[PDB]
Amino acid sequence: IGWRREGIKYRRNELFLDVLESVNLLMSPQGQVLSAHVSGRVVMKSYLSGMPECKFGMNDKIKQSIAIDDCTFHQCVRLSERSISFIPPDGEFELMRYRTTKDIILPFRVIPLVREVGRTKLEVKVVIKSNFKPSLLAQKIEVRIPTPLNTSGVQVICMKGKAKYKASENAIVWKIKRMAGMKESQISAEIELLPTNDKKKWARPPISMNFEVPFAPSGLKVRYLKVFEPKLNYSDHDVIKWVRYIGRSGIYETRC
């Protein structure tokens, strides 16, 4: 084996699995998902004695059951339910990489409301709703609301988090440290507008979000990670196993 030496030993046989996923979305003003997909990778961190023969099993029939459009593996994976079999490198390594498009959990719903006031003001209300287990917290949430070029100033009211008008970037950035699943939040903003060439209207860019959630938006779940070492005297249940899910936004836009 060119990726793993042979005399490795550890008193504490332990492994760490990381399900990293980027969830991307393009949503219309009328709530239709124009486009959506997830890109994930499973990173394994393992400190196992010998030359262990592991079995990675996830919810792949295609309750809990998800479809994988495509995917790639680490050379150690022996290709041919039918699950992943390998003798992993020691330390950290990327076990697999995959994409998903079907039955994707969109962690956040963005509901925008814009109202024009003559030519001097824009009235914006943006509501964000978290679509996930209430015991789970989203972290690092950011809502980005674009403002027109002719913005002379911005007033915002937000009961949760902090928001800043960014002239330079032409946008209102609302930041929230954490937010529990199944919740609602809103931001109100009054955009003060300068005179402008009447003829050219404003092409309103989408409202975009940044967030990090503790579950895989694709719905993927680790079932088991079976360790077998025929020579050495530790069995699968001697192994200490941990899994973590870090789902993060990729492109996540809401057309207003």
């Binding site: 200490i240 196993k241 941990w242 899994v243 973590r244």
Partner: peptide
């Protein structure tokens, strides 16, 4: 965060 696998 990390959770014990089954």
């Amino acid at each position: 965060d990390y959770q014990r696998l089954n």
